[PDB]
Symmetry: D2
Subunit: 463 residues, 4 copies
Amino acid sequence: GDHGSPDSYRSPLASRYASPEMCFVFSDRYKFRTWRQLWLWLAEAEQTLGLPITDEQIREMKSNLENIDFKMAAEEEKRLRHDVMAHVHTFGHCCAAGIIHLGATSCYVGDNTDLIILRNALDLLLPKLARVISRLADFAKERASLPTLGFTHFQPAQLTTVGKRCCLWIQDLCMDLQNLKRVRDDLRFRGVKGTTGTQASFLQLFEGDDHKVEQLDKMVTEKAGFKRAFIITGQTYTRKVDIEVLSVLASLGASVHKICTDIRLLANLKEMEEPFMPYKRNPMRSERCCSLARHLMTLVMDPLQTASVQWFERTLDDSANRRICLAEAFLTADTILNTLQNISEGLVVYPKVIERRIRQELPFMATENIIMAMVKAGGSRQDCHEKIRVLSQQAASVVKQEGGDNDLIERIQVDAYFSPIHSQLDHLLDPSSFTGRASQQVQRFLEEEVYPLLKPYESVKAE
Amino acid sequence: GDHGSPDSYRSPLASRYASPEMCFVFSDRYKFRTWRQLWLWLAEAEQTLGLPITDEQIREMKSNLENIDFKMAAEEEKRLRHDVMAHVHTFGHCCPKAAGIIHLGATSCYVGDNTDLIILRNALDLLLPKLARVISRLADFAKERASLPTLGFTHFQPAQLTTVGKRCCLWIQDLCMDLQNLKRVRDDLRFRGVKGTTGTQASFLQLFEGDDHKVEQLDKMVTEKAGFKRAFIITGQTYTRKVDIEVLSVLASLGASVHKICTDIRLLANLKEMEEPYKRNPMRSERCCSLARHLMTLVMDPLQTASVQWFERTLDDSANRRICLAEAFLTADTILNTLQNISEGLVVYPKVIERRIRQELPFMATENIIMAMVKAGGSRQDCHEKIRVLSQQAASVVKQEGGDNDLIERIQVDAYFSPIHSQLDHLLDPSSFTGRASQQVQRFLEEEVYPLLKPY
Amino acid sequence: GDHGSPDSYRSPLASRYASPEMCFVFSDRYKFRTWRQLWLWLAEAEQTLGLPITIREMKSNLENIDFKMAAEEEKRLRHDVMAHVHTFGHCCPKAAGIIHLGATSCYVGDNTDLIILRNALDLLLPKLARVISRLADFAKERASLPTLGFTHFQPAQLTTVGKRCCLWIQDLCMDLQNLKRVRDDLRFRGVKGTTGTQASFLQLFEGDDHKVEQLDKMVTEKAGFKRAFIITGQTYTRKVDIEVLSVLASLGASVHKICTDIRLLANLKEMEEPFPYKRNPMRSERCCSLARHLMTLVMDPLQTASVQWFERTLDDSANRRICLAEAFLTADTILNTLQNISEGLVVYPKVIERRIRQELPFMATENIIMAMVKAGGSRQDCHEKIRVLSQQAASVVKQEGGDNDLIERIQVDAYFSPIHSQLDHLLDPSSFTGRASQQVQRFLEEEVYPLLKPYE
Amino acid sequence: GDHGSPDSYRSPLASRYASPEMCFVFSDRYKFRTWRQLWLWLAEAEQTLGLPITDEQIREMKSNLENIDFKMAAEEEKRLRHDVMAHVHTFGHCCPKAAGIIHLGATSCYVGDNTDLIILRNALDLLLPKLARVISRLADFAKERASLPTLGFTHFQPAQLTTVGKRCCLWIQDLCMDLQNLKRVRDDLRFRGVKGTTGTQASFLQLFEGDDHKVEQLDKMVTEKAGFKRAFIITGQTYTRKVDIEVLSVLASLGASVHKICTDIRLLANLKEMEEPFYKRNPMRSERCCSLARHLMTLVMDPLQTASVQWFERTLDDSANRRICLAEAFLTADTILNTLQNISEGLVVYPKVIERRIRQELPFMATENIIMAMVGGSRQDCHEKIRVLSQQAASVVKQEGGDNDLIERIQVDAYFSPIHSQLDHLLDPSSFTGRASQQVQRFLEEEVYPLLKPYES
Ligand SMILES: Nc1ncnc2c1ncn2[C@@H]1O[C@H](COP(=O)(O)O)[C@@H](O)[C@H]1O
Ligand SMILES: Nc1ncnc2c1ncn2[C@@H]1O[C@H](COP(=O)(O)O)[C@@H](O)[C@H]1O
Ligand SMILES: Nc1ncnc2c1ncn2[C@@H]1O[C@H](COP(=O)(O)O)[C@@H](O)[C@H]1O
Ligand SMILES: Nc1ncnc2c1ncn2[C@@H]1O[C@H](COP(=O)(O)O)[C@@H](O)[C@H]1O
Ligand SMILES: [Cl-]
Ligand SMILES: [Cl-]
Ligand SMILES: [Cl-]
Ligand SMILES: [Cl-]
């Protein structure tokens, strides 16, 4: 087992889905290395502020951040039924021992690690989402002027373009990118707060010096790479934070489910397919994204409920739930972005299928323009409307009652009434003349909104 | 290793929480051995109904149900991008004589769906006795404490006395509703059987040269081999994903029951009236609420999934079900194992309970005091007013001074209540305020609980 | 006015969606009438058990509800049940003293909610049965009409229009069984006192437990319920609300799936909702919209039950006013709308036929190979030859936007001369539907009609 | 009547809970007045950009924005089975000159969607001041009570003392995050504008005879008339239903905050340490807040599911759901904030009840400082001797239902002779509250007051 024995349950998010990078962020090695990192930082800062901590103690700790004895820690945890003290012991064993965790409570490691993990998990998602957006934007640009049947109520509607529709998709994902970046940036550090949030043990440690306590809190926050620490906590950071993070993943799920549902419907229509020659192909990656996106939406109710029933300075009914929902929300989001990147790399378009479908539907939407051209030729709008209405009903009935191709244009051609227009008919039915401002909209959107958001991710010159 | 390297995420449900039995039911070994079992049962039934399958082919399959080369299946899935096809191939590799007849006529869901149904039913069967055992233990506690008065709480404020056992029956009753729900869903679970790519059995009909009777026989025979009483007549490719709603909905409701019970226990621990088996934290109860919450959340997965299945099925159910079905059962198992341990060891502190009743009961006793004063030949009008002023004073000592409730002491030295003084002991006997609590416990256990547990 | 002024928010469920019958079940008039009806049943039973009571000015004033007075009382007391005892007592001067004799507020509040829930289920059941019956008529009508099967919303082994309708019918039949079980299993709260201990009643009957049990039996029987709880706190267990809204949520999932399928078939022009060029399946869209809210709402009672403390907390009350009515008014609307969709549902066989003509040839190549082998050809060779023609046809379709000409390519090819005479029969769509039509028949005879018989 | 007759279901959110102002924002009068406002603005802008619309047509529409014939609209809707077309016809009745130009070029969503956006923003602007007031009132209380020791609770068991004001800061902090969220969502809300049937503006482009600049300017002009800084460039028929998730998710999070705060107050009410403003009193307002906050949380699943299954340029399966969830979420949030303002206005505290509970629990928390004070004694010996006294004190409390007599046991014991002199001082409750008071002062100065300064009036 690197994901373990097949003789016991193994989470598919670990064993089947998420990237090894995100799997590692939520691994026990990452967690426990981070606990040691935090104890190292507490030591460093406690020394600076005058506590009795030698340079030598700080070096032996720094030298053993990664040398974690998991068999030992498991045995100690089993005996003490307390994970942090088990790790204090184990870290002391290879180390500095008497001053590890000096003055701190358990959440100094547990809760601050959770915050580092959440932020690092966001930092993994962000470039992946930007890559998907960038890949879709290339597609939108390429296909900006390609007419395609519009759909409202999934019924034929005013033509759009393949690239304009792709912009609906991109825009939602751009809102996600802004949301994730905001949440990542605004995440605050718990810091040093004590059992109930009052910093009592640290205040005793610093012999009543409130300013040394405030300095320590700022120092560990800065070492952890956070710009801001909470002033106010109970035992832990407010679980409202977990709602904020999972809500943004839930809304990302909704965007992806919509996008991948559209692609599935386009695949049925044979207009677009997932990246690669068999005649029948199933949109399995999009089906998978929808399946996983749904679980992201579902999971938002976990942190909403948890926060709602936290009592006072903390109840421990948050712990098991968070171990599952935070890790699994991010493993799920990771998988979805990885798959969606793959989807976005070489979407297959069939312009001749799209054209055929337009040829079958457009004439029903062209009748106003035909009416205008007759009236421009000095015809009667009224008479023309009545006549064209009857031809259209007849064409529609051939389609449904006979299962034939649409013959409206043929009907108009052999009708002498429309003789003043027969020479304009090809021009009047040119699909590019029905797509409104779709291509211009693509260009403006990409220039004004999409590329500026992508500029921090970019990662040839005139000479 | 067994649970994997510490360099990946490892589910807490596997490594921390659930029993080995439930973890085994949701293991890849059990899943794939069951795929092979289903292929064996298909071959046996098909041979019986006249298809060209040999005893040697059958013996080969039977001999290799557990002999699963997980490495080969992983490689072949990477190549084929199809999990069932990968396992058909892998099973044909260790069963070369049988290779050509494995999966004959079937679509992938034949093994996938039917195995999930077998797993769901077996998971229900592990839960049901554990739930019965929790109910039995709480029933014993309820009988033992049926007559033990305790302060009633409405709005979490002092109310008409109950008994420790009577309150316990609130917990038990919800859990009995859960036992009944789980049993009904278990007994009512139908097998998908043999249905074909779109549910029409077209492949099987062709194999049997248009003999509809043989197709129906095949469906009956695999169903019976699988230990199910009934198969669907109607399916698309999959069994209706409405089934997953039915199963996870009863688990969600069980989560709500547990969350409430364990909330009350956590409050009782604050009150120092009851504890789980000087600072002592109700951590098992906290863990149960925490996991019960997840059980409730998960119900939204199958509701959504079934709502957007298109036609004879879409594959957007598959990843989701891999996550939620196992998680729901592992979560439920864990709660019931933990609740078993809580139920085994509940400690009651009667002296604390009695102290609290003595602090609160005098304020609820004023009516009784009036009636005795009245029957002694006193003014219902005047006795109310006299007692009300003493009560206002006593209430101020409690809230304004943080003092003990001295309402009875007040009445004892007030001569207007002379007719009543001899009776005060008896007028404030907490046993006389519990209404029918203890009788309710006895009737409930005899009429409702014991009969439900008799089968376990 | 009847739905109020347009200058405030008015629920669309009342003003736009639900039937007047369902609206009236969740009306204040129905609610407060039932309060008085309960008060009459309480006084009647109390008299039969010998309390001091002679009932007719109560039975007189069941409908004579002075809403103006009651609102003034409630402002004054900030307690709805208190307000209506005073009001009913105002118009009932002869009985004011004996109204609510012994009871806590939940005697009217909670039992009325159970009466309302059961009456609401009783409005839904016939509606659901009727929809099922209409869909069954349609399934039988179209049992043999071949239609393109769909998995992943890609072409798959043919089904029939009627067989696909059976997928929809089955999910609804499960809903009908669920709704009937919950209706039949609903227990009355009866007479239970403030914390569930019947202390006030025990007192009233001077310690006679038997009479308290009898009273409880009597009011339950008067309310038309078979069974009361033995065990309650102040209220019936809010687990009941989970059981009810969960079955509604599952109904929403069924309906959302069915109406999604209809919307897809509407895009394909194979089906249309009953009678401009553009035809939109707006009733099916509305059903999906509302079904979605029905699934959403299950999280309300789940959360509520999970955080009820001890013998009850009042944080259930506002929530239940919203979610219970809304769930039933939503479900009423969906059933009404779905009935309307079923009535005149339009099928276009020639559209269905044309699409099968475009897709079936790609699924027919195995049968053509078999016919050629039978004519003494190589399986392998024939496969290669038909593969090249199939790729040509697929390119016409996807690369050129043409009609599928595979059958024509085979017809004009001399290699396939041994089966040219058989092609028309080899491509007969009815020969590709497997057991679809027989399954419709078996399902309707064994499962649907027996289920509907009781609703005849 | 005003909320309708008692013979039908009447939403309790209208009839029983929400403020009349929020009820008005989600009323039909407001909705259909706003549809008319949007039609007028469209006509003004189109006229300016050169379409054949006259001043008297504009004046006619302007004169009739409130003159809504609801009976006629209902009859038209029963006839047309379409709400926007019914209202176009009905407006055209009271505006006969303008009738032919009402809705020119627009699709139905031009009024429906833009009105919803105006409504969401106006609803957000009604909540924000209410939330600010709650925060202010709690901040006042937190400052007053900043140094009042009270038992800390983890796992709802005795823990290191906090203060009444510090604990209040937990509540205030969550609500400040809500205030920031609501403001953000409000400020970032974009207008749908003029987009056409599938969002391509084809109809407008043709009206302007192919002049893209005119189409772009029309969209800008209506957006500016509606008081929005920014319009979408990209839409289908509708604004993206992701917007509805963004708004209801912030409301759901506020529900979570409120549920937690009011759960704490209900627990304090049990302990008799704090009560809601004016012997047995029930925290019924806090209970109702929890009840409604729960519904606000539940509602988040509606928009999530809706957005997830919107096909292409839109499907109509959003419409009925949005009629219910958007109004209800806001009417629920309104009610909660109205009630919470009342709860926050005069919280009752009982210091002597608080003090007694601290006296019962603090000895068990003070044992470390006793050992420190003894340690010129022995850390090992003092710890073993103090342990047995704590076992004796704990069994009195639990097994015998008595008062905590640990301090007495120490006082009588000759061993602790050298510490008896300082025992009162060692058990001073203010010495156990850590930095609670200072944390409150810094929080209020740094984080809360600056957030509230924009709401001074
Ligand atoms: N106040 C606390 N803060 C942090 N961890 C705790 C606290 N109390 C107990 N624990 C430990 O945290 C872990 C919780 O386990 P679980 O419920 O499985 O997440 C166990 O090791 C507990 O012993
Ligand atoms: N119609 C089908 N029935 C069963 N399994 C399928 C079907 N189509 C594809 N699969 C396979 O099902 C698995 C789905 O993977 P996941 O989405 O990760 O659960 C993949 O290996 C697919 O190739
Ligand atoms: N124990 C109780 N049983 C029944 N109703 C109560 C109880 N306590 C208060 N009430 C009333 O129940 C109603 C709750 O209103 P709401 O929270 O708006 O549903 C109010 O009129 C309360 O005064
Ligand atoms: N494409 C559309 N855009 C806006 N409204 C529409 C559209 N199609 C239909 N409607 C109308 O929108 C309303 C939807 O009503 P409901 O489904 O009850 O919310 C009905 O009056 C419909 O006729
Ligand atoms: Cl700390
Ligand atoms: Cl099968
Ligand atoms: Cl009662
Ligand atoms: Cl528009």
